[PDB]
Amino acid sequence: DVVMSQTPLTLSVTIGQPASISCKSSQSLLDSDGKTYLNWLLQRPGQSPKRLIYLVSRLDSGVPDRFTGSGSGTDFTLKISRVEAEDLGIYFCWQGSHFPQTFGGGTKLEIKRADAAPTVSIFPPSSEQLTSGGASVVCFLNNFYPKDINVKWKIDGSERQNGVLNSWTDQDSKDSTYSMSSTLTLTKDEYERHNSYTCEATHKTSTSPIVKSFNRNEC
Amino acid sequence: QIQLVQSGPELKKPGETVKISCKASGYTFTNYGMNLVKQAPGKGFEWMGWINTFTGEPTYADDFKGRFVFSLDTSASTAYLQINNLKNEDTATYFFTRGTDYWGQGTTLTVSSAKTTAPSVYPLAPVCGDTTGSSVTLGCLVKGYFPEPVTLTWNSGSLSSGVHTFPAVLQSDLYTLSSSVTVTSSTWPSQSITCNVAHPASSTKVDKKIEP
């Protein structure tokens, strides 16, 4: 079982700069028919993979010379001489030379872009949810960059972790930012036992937390 | 127009069977070999085998030469992946590919004794930044459902800009997902912003307008 070792796990590159991705197989990828079936694919956010290169170095139609594939035996390299906006996504190799075919782990390619503070919005529980005896306080922190961010919840000033569920989007194709969703769910009994609810984000674009909060008292 | 359209999401109990289909078009079906790939949740890709679209002969990877069947309906350019005696390990999203260049959207299969639980959809209206940036962000909360997947869109898909629909999160033994859409302070409440959701596994489809 040929193992495809892809490195690095993630790459962050500035538009116009080069990017190098590696795939090494545990065994030689030279097939019995004399060919070397090493493919390179690209899976854009939300999209299904699409092959860019086959047979180690042949480009599929449409693919720019920016992309080159090289190597032989066990060492293969996907190269982008000048990276760009459209390139962001997950890359991975796929070898079809031996039974069974195997895929590389993948390399998430991040395209650097100017810093952006997260746009924060906090939402009190919806009326229709307070009738079911549950209460959820949703908080969005959208279109920020870099990806490193940290959210903290505070009820009447006390940090709250129990009941917090977070979710993050991959890098966006349009503006290359990241978004986060943090949802604090507690019981209506408890929710009604506290006043102010706060959503705090710690991001590089601010030395002080980027806060957003409301008071249950609709005040 | 080269496309591979696979059958929809599937929820099965350990022991039942599933026959997933992939309708192809946009090229000469029988000139391309077809591969079958499995992807366990959060895991990488796994090659299940392939089918010779000309001869119809299937070939299975060792881990799938027991309860998996690959078949065709050549005349209809359709390939089929059947899994018998379903086990929890079979839970994942499966794909059909044209050789190595094109992929289908993939179909998600969940195998568990647990019973389908429809999602609860709550709208989310402002209460903070009025017009400190002239922008407005609204949301829609989908919680307590099982299993994956679910589908969400704003105003039937007629609104896909400034939208962020995050990956669902396994809370208890239930998934929760949310989405947000940002519009100009004017556009709302001036216009109607409705949330659309559908939970195939529980034949569910709901809406929820967002109001002040």
Place this chain on the structure above:
Amino acid sequence: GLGGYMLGSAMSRPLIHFGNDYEDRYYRENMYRYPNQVYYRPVDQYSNQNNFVHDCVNITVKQHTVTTTTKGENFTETDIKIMERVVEQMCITQYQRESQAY
């Protein structure tokens, strides 16, 4: 499918000539991606060479592209163009072989 078809023994790829040193240089540098053996039905099952040949070309070409694209490949209009020409010569040679050994 491939019912009743035999796989012929490997042979030298025919040197097919094109004037333009480009197509030539292309066939030369790409023949490794084309077949060097063919599929055929016993020759006693055809009335003439043209039937044996036409059948042999379609089967060999089809089998080749489905099995090779499975591992990762791309056959253009040129690749198909060239392949049918070369495989045809090989099929005619496979025909000679069959009728000679009869």
